[PDB]
């Protein structure tokens, strides 16, 4: 959940989303991606990322 319900603001906004990101809930569904928890993010999107646990399959 959020952690700025006692402040609220631009920073609080990005802090809310970012906060939720850290605690990726999708992990419950992405039991597979759960590995990294956000491996679904590093997936790529563009045409590369890093090189830690194929977050897509073949990067």
């Amino acid at each position: 959940p959020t952690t700025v319900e006692g402040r609220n603001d631009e920073k609080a906004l990005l802090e809310q989303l970012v906060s939720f990101l850290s605690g990726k809930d999708e992990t419950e569904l992405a039991e597979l991606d759960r590995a990294l928890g956000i491996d679904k993010l590093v997936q790529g999107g563009g045409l590369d990322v890093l090189s830690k646990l194929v977050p897509r399959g073949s990067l």
Partner: protein
């Protein structure tokens, strides 16, 4: 760089992650991230926060 960021975009960001993360998501993140830079910087930071750690530099 006068206005912060649309309070409706951030909602799309957090609402985007809700997606599966791969198909639309990719376009969703890039979408908002595009329609919102300040957001991207945040999200991007989060995404890289997974590597930036493993790979120190940026």
């Amino acid at each position: 760089p006068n206005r912060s960021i649309s309070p409706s975009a951030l909602q799309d960001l957090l609402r985007t992650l809700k997606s599966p993360s791969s198909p639309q998501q990719q376009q969703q993140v890039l979408n908002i991230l595009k329609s919102n830079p300040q957001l991207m910087a945040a999200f991007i930071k989060q995404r890289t926060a997974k590597y930036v750690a493993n790979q120190p530099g940026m």
